[PDB]
Short mmCIF file of C-alpha atoms and ligand atoms in Angstrom, two decimals:
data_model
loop_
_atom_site.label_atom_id
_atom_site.label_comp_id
_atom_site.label_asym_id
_atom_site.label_seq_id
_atom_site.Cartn_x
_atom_site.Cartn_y
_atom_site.Cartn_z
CA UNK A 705 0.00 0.00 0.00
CA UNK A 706 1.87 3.00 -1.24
CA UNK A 707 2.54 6.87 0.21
CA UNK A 708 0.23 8.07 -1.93
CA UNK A 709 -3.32 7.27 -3.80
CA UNK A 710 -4.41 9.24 -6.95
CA UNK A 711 -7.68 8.78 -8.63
CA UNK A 712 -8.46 8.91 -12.24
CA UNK A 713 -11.47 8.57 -14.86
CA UNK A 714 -11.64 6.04 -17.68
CA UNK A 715 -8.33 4.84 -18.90
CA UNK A 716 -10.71 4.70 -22.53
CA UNK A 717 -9.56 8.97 -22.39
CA UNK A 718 -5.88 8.06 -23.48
CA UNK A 719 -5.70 12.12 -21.49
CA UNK A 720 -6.30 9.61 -18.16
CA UNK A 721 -3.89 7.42 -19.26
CA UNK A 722 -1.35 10.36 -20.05
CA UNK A 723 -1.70 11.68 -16.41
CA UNK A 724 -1.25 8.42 -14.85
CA UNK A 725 2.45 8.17 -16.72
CA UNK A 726 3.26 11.58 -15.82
CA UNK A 727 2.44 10.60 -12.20
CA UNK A 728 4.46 7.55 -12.06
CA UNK A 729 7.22 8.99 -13.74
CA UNK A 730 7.50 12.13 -10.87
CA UNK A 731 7.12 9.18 -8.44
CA UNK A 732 10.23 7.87 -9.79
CA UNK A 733 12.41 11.28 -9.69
CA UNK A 734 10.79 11.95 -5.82
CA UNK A 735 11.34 8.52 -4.89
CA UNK A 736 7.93 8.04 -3.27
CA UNK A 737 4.91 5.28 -3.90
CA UNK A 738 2.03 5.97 -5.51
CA UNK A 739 -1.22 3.29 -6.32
CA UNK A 740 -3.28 4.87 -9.15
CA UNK A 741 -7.17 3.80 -9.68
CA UNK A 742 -9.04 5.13 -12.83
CA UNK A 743 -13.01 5.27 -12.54
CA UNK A 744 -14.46 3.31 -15.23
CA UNK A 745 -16.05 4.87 -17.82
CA UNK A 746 -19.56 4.16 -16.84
CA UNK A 747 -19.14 4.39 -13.21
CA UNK A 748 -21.20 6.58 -11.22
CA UNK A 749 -20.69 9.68 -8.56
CA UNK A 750 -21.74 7.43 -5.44
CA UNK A 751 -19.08 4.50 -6.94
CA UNK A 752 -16.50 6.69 -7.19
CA UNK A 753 -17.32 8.35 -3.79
CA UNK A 754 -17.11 4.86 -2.36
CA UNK A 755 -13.54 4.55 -3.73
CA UNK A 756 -12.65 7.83 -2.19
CA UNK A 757 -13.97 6.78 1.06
CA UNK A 758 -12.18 3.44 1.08
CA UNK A 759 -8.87 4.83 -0.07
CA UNK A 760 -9.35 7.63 2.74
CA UNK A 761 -9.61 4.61 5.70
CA UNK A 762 -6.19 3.30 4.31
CA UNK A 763 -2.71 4.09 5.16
CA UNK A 764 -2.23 6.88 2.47
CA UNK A 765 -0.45 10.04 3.39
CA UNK A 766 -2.58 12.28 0.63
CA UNK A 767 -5.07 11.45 -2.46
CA UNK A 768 -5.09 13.66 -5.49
CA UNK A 769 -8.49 13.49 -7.60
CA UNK A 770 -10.14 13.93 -11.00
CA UNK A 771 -13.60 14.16 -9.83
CA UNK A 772 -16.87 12.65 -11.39
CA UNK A 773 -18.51 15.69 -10.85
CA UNK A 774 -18.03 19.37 -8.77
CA UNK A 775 -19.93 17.97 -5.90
CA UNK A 776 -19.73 14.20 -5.79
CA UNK A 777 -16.15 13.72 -3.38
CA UNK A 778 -17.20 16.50 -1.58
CA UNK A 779 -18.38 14.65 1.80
CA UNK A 780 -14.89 11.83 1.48
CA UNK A 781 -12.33 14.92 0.22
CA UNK A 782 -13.92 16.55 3.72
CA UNK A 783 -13.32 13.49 5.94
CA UNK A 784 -10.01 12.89 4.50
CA UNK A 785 -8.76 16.48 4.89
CA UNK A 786 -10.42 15.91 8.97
CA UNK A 787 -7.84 12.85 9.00
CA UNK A 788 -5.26 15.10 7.96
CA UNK A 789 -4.65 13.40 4.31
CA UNK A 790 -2.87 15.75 2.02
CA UNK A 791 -5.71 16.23 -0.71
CA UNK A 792 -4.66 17.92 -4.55
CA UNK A 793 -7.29 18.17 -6.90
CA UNK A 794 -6.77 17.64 -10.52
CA UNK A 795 -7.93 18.90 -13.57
CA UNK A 796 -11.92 19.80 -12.57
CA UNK A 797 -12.91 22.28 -9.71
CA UNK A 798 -14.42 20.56 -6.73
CA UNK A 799 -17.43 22.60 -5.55
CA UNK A 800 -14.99 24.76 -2.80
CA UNK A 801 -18.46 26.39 -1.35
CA UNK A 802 -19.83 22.94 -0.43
CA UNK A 803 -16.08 21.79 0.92
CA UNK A 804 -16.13 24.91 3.10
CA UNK A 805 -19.95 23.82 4.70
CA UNK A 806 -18.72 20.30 4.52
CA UNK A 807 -15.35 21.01 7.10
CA UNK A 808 -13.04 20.23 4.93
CA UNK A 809 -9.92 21.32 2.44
CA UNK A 810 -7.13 20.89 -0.10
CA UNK A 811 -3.81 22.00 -0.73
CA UNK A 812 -3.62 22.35 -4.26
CA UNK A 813 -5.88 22.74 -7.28
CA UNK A 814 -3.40 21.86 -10.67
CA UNK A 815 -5.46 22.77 -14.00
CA UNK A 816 -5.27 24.36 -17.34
CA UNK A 817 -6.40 27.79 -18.44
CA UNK A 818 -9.64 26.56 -20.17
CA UNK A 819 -10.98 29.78 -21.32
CA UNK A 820 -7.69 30.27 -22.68
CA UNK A 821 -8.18 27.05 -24.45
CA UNK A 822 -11.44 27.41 -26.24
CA UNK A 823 -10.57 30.91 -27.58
CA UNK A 824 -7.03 29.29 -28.62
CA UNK A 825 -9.32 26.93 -30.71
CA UNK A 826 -11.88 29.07 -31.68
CA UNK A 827 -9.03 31.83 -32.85
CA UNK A 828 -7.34 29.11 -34.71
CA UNK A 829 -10.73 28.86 -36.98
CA UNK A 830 -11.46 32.09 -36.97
CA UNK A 831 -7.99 33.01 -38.61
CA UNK A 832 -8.16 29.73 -41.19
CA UNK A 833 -11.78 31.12 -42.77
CA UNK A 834 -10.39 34.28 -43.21
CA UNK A 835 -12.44 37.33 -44.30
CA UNK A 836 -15.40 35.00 -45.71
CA UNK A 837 -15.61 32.88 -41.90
CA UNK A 838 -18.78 31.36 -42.23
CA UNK A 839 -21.05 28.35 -39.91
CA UNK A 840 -19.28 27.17 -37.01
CA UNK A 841 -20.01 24.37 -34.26
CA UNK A 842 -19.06 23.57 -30.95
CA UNK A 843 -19.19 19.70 -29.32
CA UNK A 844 -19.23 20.12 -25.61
CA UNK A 845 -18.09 17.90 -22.80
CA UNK A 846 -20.67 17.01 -20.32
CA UNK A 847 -23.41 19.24 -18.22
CA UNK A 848 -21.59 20.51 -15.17
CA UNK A 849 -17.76 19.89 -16.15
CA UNK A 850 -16.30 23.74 -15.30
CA UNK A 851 -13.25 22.75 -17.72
CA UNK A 852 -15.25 21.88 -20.34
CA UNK A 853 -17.80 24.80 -20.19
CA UNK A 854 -14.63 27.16 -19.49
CA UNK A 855 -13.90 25.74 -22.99
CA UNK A 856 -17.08 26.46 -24.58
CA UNK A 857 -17.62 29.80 -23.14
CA UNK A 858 -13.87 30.66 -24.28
CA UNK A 859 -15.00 29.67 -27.90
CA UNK A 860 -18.28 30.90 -28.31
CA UNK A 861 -17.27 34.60 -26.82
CA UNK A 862 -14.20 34.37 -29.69
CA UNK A 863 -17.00 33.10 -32.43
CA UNK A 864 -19.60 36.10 -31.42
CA UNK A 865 -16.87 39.11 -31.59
CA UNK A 866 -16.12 37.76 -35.18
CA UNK A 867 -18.72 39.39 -37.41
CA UNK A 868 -18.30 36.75 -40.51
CA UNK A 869 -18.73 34.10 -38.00
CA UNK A 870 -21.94 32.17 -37.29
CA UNK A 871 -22.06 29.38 -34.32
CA UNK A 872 -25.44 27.56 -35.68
CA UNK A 873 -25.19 24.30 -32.99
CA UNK A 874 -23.42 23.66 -29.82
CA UNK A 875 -24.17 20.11 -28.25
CA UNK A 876 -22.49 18.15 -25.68
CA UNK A 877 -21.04 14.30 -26.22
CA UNK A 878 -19.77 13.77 -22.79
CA UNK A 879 -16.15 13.41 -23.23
CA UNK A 880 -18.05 9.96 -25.72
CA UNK A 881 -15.91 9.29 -29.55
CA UNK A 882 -19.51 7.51 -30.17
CA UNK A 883 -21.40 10.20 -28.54
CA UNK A 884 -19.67 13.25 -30.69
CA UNK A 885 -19.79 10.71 -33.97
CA UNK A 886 -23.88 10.44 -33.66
CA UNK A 887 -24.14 14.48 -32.50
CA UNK A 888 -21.73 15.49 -35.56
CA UNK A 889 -23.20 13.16 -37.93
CA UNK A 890 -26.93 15.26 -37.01
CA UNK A 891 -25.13 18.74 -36.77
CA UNK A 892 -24.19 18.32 -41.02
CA UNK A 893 -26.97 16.91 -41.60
CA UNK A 894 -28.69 20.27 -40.56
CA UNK A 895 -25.98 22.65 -41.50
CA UNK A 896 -24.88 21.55 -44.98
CA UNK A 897 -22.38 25.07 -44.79
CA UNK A 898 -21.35 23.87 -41.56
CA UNK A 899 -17.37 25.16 -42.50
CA UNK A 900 -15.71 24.09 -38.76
CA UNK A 901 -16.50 21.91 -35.68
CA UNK A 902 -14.45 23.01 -32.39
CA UNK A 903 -14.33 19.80 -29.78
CA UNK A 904 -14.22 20.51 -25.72
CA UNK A 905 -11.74 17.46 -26.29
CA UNK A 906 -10.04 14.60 -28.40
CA UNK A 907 -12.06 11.22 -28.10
CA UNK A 908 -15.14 13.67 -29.16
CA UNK A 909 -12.98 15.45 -31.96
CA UNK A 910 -12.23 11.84 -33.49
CA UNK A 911 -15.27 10.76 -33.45
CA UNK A 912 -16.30 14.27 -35.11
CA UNK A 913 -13.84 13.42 -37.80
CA UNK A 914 -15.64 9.99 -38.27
CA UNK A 915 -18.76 11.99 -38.78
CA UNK A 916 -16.77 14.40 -42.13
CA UNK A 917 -15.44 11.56 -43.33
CA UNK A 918 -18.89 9.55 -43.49
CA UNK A 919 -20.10 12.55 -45.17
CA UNK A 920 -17.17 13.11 -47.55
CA UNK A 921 -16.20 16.18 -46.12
CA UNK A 922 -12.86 15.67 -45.35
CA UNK A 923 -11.00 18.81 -45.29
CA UNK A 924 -13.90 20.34 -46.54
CA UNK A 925 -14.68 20.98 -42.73
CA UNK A 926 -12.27 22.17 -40.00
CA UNK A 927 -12.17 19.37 -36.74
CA UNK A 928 -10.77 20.93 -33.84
CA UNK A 929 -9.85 18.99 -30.49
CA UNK A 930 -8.31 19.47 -26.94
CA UNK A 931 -5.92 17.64 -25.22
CA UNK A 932 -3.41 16.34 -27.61
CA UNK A 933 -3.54 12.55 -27.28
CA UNK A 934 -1.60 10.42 -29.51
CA UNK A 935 -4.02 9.45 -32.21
CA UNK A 936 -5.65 13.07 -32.57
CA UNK A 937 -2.27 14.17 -33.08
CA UNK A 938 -1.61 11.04 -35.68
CA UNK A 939 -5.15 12.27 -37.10
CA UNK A 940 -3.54 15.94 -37.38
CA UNK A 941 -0.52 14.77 -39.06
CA UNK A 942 -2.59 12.88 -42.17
CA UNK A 943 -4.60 15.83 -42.11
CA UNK A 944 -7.92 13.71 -40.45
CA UNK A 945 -8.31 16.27 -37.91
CA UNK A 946 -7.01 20.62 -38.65
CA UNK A 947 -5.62 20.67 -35.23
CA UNK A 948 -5.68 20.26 -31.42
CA UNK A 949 -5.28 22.73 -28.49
CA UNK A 950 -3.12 20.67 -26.44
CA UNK A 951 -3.13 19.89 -22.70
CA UNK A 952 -0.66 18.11 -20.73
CA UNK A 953 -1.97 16.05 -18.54
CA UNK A 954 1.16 13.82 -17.99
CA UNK A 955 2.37 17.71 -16.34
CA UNK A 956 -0.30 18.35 -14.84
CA UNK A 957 -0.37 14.84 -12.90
CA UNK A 958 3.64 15.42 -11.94
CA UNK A 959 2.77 18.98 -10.71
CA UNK A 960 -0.60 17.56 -8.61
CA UNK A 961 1.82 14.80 -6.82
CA UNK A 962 4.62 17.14 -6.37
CA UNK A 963 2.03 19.75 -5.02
CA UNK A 964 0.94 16.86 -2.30
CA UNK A 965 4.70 15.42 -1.76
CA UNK A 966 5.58 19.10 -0.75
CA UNK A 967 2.76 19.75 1.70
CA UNK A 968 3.09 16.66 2.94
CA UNK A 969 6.83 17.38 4.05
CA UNK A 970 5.39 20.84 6.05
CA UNK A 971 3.52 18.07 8.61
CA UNK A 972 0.54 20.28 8.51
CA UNK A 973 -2.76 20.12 6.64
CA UNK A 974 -3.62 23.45 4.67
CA UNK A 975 -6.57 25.09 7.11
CA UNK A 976 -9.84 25.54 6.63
CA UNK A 977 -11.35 28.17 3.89
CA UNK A 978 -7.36 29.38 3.14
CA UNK A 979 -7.48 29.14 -0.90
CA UNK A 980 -5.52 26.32 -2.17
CA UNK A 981 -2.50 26.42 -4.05
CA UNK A 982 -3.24 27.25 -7.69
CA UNK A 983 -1.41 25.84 -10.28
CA UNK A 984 -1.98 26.24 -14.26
CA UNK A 985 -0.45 23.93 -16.89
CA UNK A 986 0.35 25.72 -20.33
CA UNK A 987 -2.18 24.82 -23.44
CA UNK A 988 -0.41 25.01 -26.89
CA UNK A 989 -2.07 25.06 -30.55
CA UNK A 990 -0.41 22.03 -32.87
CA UNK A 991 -1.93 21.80 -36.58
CA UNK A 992 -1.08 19.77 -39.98
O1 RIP B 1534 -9.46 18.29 -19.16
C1 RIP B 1534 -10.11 17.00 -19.30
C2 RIP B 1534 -9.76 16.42 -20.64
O2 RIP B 1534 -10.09 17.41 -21.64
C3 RIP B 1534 -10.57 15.14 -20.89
O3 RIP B 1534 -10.35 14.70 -22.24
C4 RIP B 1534 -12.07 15.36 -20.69
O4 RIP B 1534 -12.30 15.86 -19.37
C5 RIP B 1534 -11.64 17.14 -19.19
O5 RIP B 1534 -11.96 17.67 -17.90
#
């Protein structure tokens, strides 16, 4: 049973399975244990609240999370924190208003600038339709994710300030290559001058690409993702997909442990209501 416990979503997001690396790799420079458990990708918030719970009454000095949802590891993050666990969240905001009611804390929250993300994207499109822009979409991640809808608001603000661009659909496909592949398949079927899909992140953008090459319309219409997994960068590179607005999760894993290792060394907890430490991982645009 290691120093430390992190927990992940569904290895199926090749992003979870980037993060988990990353984390065993710091592990290895800072000489410390770490067991890693990814949520399947079905699971729901009282399952993985259970695993929180049950990692908590174990031996771990701190737990750094990717939660289901803002709210669902609220009640084990607070009993761990009461334990005096060294907590990090990853990647999604836990709701910090219900922490506060619910007595408990973290050190850390490690994250990317999302807003910063979508209108990276959204910029990226804007600039490729030059003067004549024209129809755009946006496939969401799901209701509720703040990283997500940081993405789509970041987008959609960057696609209304641009005069010769129209957004005519945004949907969410929950984070689902299936999911996105139905929703784009619908959205071209509707918007036959559809010119550009932006994607809140990669399994949905490849499954978006599915969608324009079912319809023929390869290259004919831009496919935009987030996170820069492997195959949507493989999909860049034969020109499948425009482009990505990469993440790094792999960092932002390293960073989260590091962020617990060093609290950890302090021998106190962070208190109560203090604002935990904030850490942002860098986004980057990669294209053809
Ligand atoms: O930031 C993460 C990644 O974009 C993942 O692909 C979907 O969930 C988001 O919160």
């Amino acid at each position: 049973a290691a120093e430390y416990a992190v927990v992940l979503k569904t290895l199926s997001n090749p992003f979870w399975v980037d993060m988990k690396k990353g984390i065993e790799d710091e592990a290895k420079t800072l000489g410390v244990s770490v067991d890693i458990f990814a949520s399947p990708s079905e699971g729901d918030f009282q399952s993985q609240l259970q695993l929180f719970e049950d990692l908590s009454n174990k031996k771990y000095k701190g737990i750094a999370f990717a939660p289901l949802s803002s709210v669902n590891l609220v009640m084990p993050v607070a009993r761990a924190w009461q334990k005096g666990l060294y907590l990090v969240n990853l990647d999604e905001k836990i709701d910090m208003d219900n922490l506060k009611k619910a007595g408990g804390n973290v050190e850390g929250f490690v994250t990317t600038d999302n807003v910063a993300v979508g209108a990276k994207g959204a910029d990226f499109i804007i600039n490729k339709l030059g003067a004549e822009g024209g129809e755009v979409a946006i496939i969401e991640g799901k209701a509720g994710n703040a990283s997500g809808e940081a993405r789509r608001n970041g987008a959609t603000e960057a696609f209304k300030k641009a005069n010769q661009i129209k957004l005519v659909a945004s949907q969410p496909a929950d984070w689902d290559r299936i999911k996105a592949l139905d929703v784009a398949t619908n959205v071209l079927q509707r918007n036959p001058n559809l010119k550009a899909f932006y994607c809140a992140n990669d399994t949905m953008a490849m499954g978006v690409a599915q969608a324009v090459a079912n319809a023929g319309k390869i290259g004919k219409v831009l496919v935009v993702g987030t996170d820069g997994i492997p195959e949507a960068r493989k999909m860049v590179e034969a020109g499948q997909m425009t482009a990505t607005v990469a993440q790094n999760p792999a960092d932002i894993g390293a960073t989260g442990l590091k962020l617990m290792v060093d609290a950890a060394k302090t021998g106190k907890v962070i208190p109560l209501e203090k604002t935990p430490e904030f850490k942002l991982v860098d986004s980057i645009l990669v294209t053809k």
